[PDB]
Every structure is written in C-alpha cells, then in structure tokens.
Amino acid sequence: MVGVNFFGDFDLASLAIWSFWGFLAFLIYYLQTENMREGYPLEMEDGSVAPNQGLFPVPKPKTFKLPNGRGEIVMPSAENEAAHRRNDLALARTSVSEGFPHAPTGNALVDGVGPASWVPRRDEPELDAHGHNKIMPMALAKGFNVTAGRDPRGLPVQAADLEVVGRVSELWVDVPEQMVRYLEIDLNSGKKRLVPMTLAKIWADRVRVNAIASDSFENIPATRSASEVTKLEEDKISGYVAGGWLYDADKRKR
Template identity: 60%
Template sequence: MVGVEFFGNTDLASIAIWLFWIFFAGLVYYLQTENMREGYPLRDDGDGVPANESLFPLPKEKTFILRDGKGTLTVPSRDYEDSKMRTDLALAQSSPSTGSPWLPTGDPMVDGVGPAAWAPRRDAPELDAHGHVKIKPMSMLPDFKISAGRDPRGKAVVGGDGEVVGRVTDMWVDVPEALVRYMTVDLNPEGSGKTRLIPINMARILPDRVKVKSLKAGNWDNVPATKSMEQVTLLEEDKITAYYAGGTLYAS
C-alpha cells in the first residue's frame, strides 16, 4: 500500500492542511501588499511617514499602462501621492497632539473639507468599455425615455427649508447602466441658464416637487458647476456629491 510502503508513518492529511495554511498565509500577504499600492506611503500630521506605517512592507514599484491612451502610472510612489494631495485645505488642528481632530476655518461646504471633502480625481469624464462618455443628458439621448416611476422634469425643486429654488429641466443617464445619475436644476424659474446638477441619490421625487433635504435656500449658488452641460468629469462628480453630502451636517 502507498500509505505503508512509501510514506510510512507520515500523516498525509496533516501535510495537506499545513500546505493549505502556508498557501493561505502567502495569499493574505500578497493581497495586503498589493492593496498598499494606492494611498501609501502614509503620512502623519507633520507630513512625514509614520513609524507604524504597516505590519507589511511596501511592495516594489510597478508601472501600469492606462487604457484609452492615458499614459502610464507607477505605484506606490511618493511623487504620485504628492501630485494627488490637496494642500490648500481650510483646516486647523484642534490640539498639538498627533491624531487630534482638524476643524474647518471657513465654509466647509465650499472649501470641501470634513464631510464635504472631495478627492482630486481626473478632470475627465468616465468612459465605458468602448471609450465613450458614460454619463450624458437625456436630452441628448433620443433612444432613452422614462419607462417607470415619476418624471421629475418640470417639477419645482425645494430644499430642506421648503423654499423653491428652481425647476428640473433634464436628467443625466449612465448610458451603459441605463440608470439616472443626476438631474439638472435651473436655479432661475425664468430659464436664465444658471444650472446645477443634483445627484439622484440626494433627492426625493414627490408627486408635485423634488426635495433635496441636505441643502437650504442659501446653499444652491455655491453648488459646484460643470464646465460643460454635455458631460461631467470625475473631479466634478466628486465635488458635486461631496457638497450635497456635506450639507447634511453643515447647511444649517
């Protein structure tokens, strides 16, 4: 028999389970180090690398070729992290001790700090698998129509204080997903063209109006605008959604 003549008293089941645990530990190590390609090296409050950065060492630099001719990206890299950092934050440390909270020194919704913080993403629109812009106004998509639910177009927009601030004029659709992402609100009912985007998740479409609870009447003028009314960039999306989300705490 194989178990007697070749392996003798060796416990094959024990070897198998130990090989599995060694493989699993190696897998955890690999996944954790690969996960450290973005956001590392870490920084402490003095803009230095903290002593207890991680239990795992940083992986070696690796260069990735980006799709759609957007060049290459090498991570982890201090230069890359420096280029992504926001250095103009309107914040002040509440105490000298490391890890103490940072407090806003201005209008946190406008400054984009705290719950209203945004990340410096690429200032280019998100593309689908074929290299086409994903999110477009429905007015530019003749093949799209409302098949279910309430159509918000033409409805008045009110904030958390109940004040009417404008009217919905269009919706923006994630074309590959066939999903509404934003609504366009004209802040002047007369149609002055002063428009802003409302994230669909931050609004409630009622039978007679669209309600955005997180903003009050005095907050709408400062909603980040888009450079184009035909597309929205990743950076603009982050700023817009952060402004509405931050209003939940800061608008009042």
C-alpha cells in the same frame, strides 16, 4: 492510507491542514500587500512621513495601461499620490497631540473639507470603450427616454429647510449602463446646478434634497461645459451635497 501515519499521529490530513495554514499565511500577506497600492506611505498630521510605515511592505509597482490614449498609471507611484493630493486645506489643529480632529476654518462645504471633501481627479470625462463620454444629458443621448418610473423633469426641488429652490430641467444619464446619475436643476436665481440622483428622492409632487439647505444650492460647483461633466467636477459636486448632512443639520427641519 487510513491510519497510515508518517510520524506520530501525523497523516495526510494533518499534512494537508498544516500546508493550508502555510498557504493561508502567504495569502493574507499577498492580499494585505496588494491592498497597499493606494494611501501609502503613511503620513503625520503635519504631512511628514511617519516613523511607522506598517508591518507588511508596500509592494512593487504595477502598471495600468489606459484606453483612449489616456496613458499609463503606475500603482504605487509618487506621481499618483501627488496628483490626488489636496493642497492648502482650510483646517486648524484641535490639539498639538496626534489623534485629535482638525476643525474647518471657514465654510467646510465651500472649502471642501470633511464629508464635503473632494479628491483632485483628472479634469477629463469618464469615457466608454468607444471613446465617447460616459455621462451625457439625455437630450444628447440619442434614443434615450424614460422607460419607466416617475419623470422628475419639471418638478420643484424642496431643500432641507423645507423651502423650494427651483425645478428639475434635465437628466444626466450613464449611457452604457442605462441609468440616471445626476439631475440638473433650474435654480430660481437663474443658474443651473447638478445634483446626484443618489441624494434626491422623487415624490409625486416634488424632489426632496435633504442634504443641503436653500442657502447652499447656489454655491454648488458649476460645470465649465453644459454638455459634459468631468470626474473632478463630479467629485466636487457630490462632496458638496453630501457635506450638508453634517454642516446643514442646524437648518434641516422636520
């Protein structure tokens, strides 16, 4: 089939490349549609549905069957967008026109806006396949010990202000994945607060948390329970800590 043109210079290779262009167009359509199972329909800064919703249509709902009796999640669904919707946000318009920032009205860390934002996830812990809780304190994880690396437990916690706020007490560990997720801190004020390991750097003599200063460690969201942490609490905590890279920069030193 060399030099065998159906018409003109059109042989099996041209047929193939044009067929691929078609398949690729269809595939881009499929992928961009499947990327629309979250975040849609589009909104205004006022919260209303926008006149423009896109050039690819939002696809048909699929259903996720959840283990552990947790139910069925439909994507896209108005129920999923309503459950993950923040209400009564503490933000003020910077301008009447669109495309301009929204300014926090109070303490954006406490009010959970901007990089300190959190999503209203379900107030239920993340579970493993057996139905147990995925994140546990290492005391409740039977068999777990520090196989390698530095043990942070007992180390003082230095903040962005270069001041010390307390000492590490316990390690919250992902049991199926065998890794540290949060380290708990005994604050000098008599309170226990969680902090993500990804935002804590273990030195030989200290644990440095440069995100937030000493003022913010006290207002960190607490867990209703001391043995378990919910997805919601996790999101609140991690947002609060991360927001300090912006809202605690004037205090940060060195």
